[PDB]
Amino acid sequence: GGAVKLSISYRNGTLFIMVMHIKDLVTEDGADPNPYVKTYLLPDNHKTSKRKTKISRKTRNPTFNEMLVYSGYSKETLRQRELQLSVLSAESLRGNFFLGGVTLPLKDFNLSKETVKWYQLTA
C-alpha cells in the first residue's frame, strides 16, 4: 500500500524523524484519502509517545516535509526502542482508517549519520 520516505538523524539528545513524502497510497473504496502520519516510540502501553503530522487533504501522494521530534533519549536507550509509524486518513463521516505502516527498530540505524530511505507500508 505504498511507501514513505523518511530522514532519520540524532543530535543533542534528540531523535529527529523528518517525514518527507509518501507515494502510491491505496484505499479500498477508491476515493482519495486525507493522510496524516503518526508515530509511537515502542514499547508504549499507555500511548504517551505520540507524534503526528498535519493532515494532507485528498491525495494518494502527500508531501509533508514535517519533523517529528523525540527529545531526551540517549543513543544507548534508543537502541532498545522501535519507531512505529502509521499512515491514517483523517475522515469526518467515518473512522480514521489505516492505510499502512512500518516499524523500524532503532538498533538498525547509524545514529551518527543521517539516514534517508524509502520504506514499504504494510498492514
From Swiss-Prot:
Places the protein is found = Cell membrane; Cytoplasmic vesicle, Clathrin-coated vesicle; Nucleus; Cytoplasm
Q: Where is the C2 domain?
A: 1-119
Name the organs or tissues of expression.
Expressed in columnar and transitional epithelia, mononuclear cells, smooth muscle cells, and endothelial cells lining capillaries and small venules (at protein level). Ubiquitously expressed, with highest levels in heart, placenta and ovary, and lowest levels in the kidney. Detected at low levels in islets of Langerhans from type 2 diabetes mellitus individuals.
Motif Nuclear localization signal extends across 49-60
Q: Superkingdom, according to UniProt?
A: Eukaryota
PTM comment text: Phosphorylated upon insulin stimulation; which may lead to enzyme activation.
Q: What does the annotation say about its assembly with partners?
A: Part of a complex with ERBB2 and EGFR. Interacts with clathrin trimers. Interacts with SBF2/MTMR13.
Q: What does this protein do?
A: Generates phosphatidylinositol 3-phosphate (PtdIns3P) and phosphatidylinositol 3,4-bisphosphate (PtdIns(3,4)P2) that act as second messengers. Has a role in several intracellular trafficking events. Functions in insulin signaling and secretion. Required for translocation of the glucose transporter SLC2A4/GLUT4 to the plasma membrane and glucose uptake in response to insulin-mediated RHOQ activation.
The record's family statement is: Belongs to the PI3/PI4-kinase family.
Involvement in disorder: Oculoskeletodental syndrome: An autosomal recessive syndrome characterized by congenital cataracts, short stature, dysmorphic features with coarse facies, dental anomalies, multiple skeletal abnormalities, and neurological manifestations. Other recurrent features include hearing loss, secondary glaucoma, and nephrocalcinosis.
The protein, known as: Phosphatidylinositol 4-phosphate 3-kinase C2 domain-containing subunit alpha
Please tell me the species this chain comes from.
Answer: Homo sapiens (Human)
Which stretch of the full-length chain is present here?
1560 to 1682 of 1686
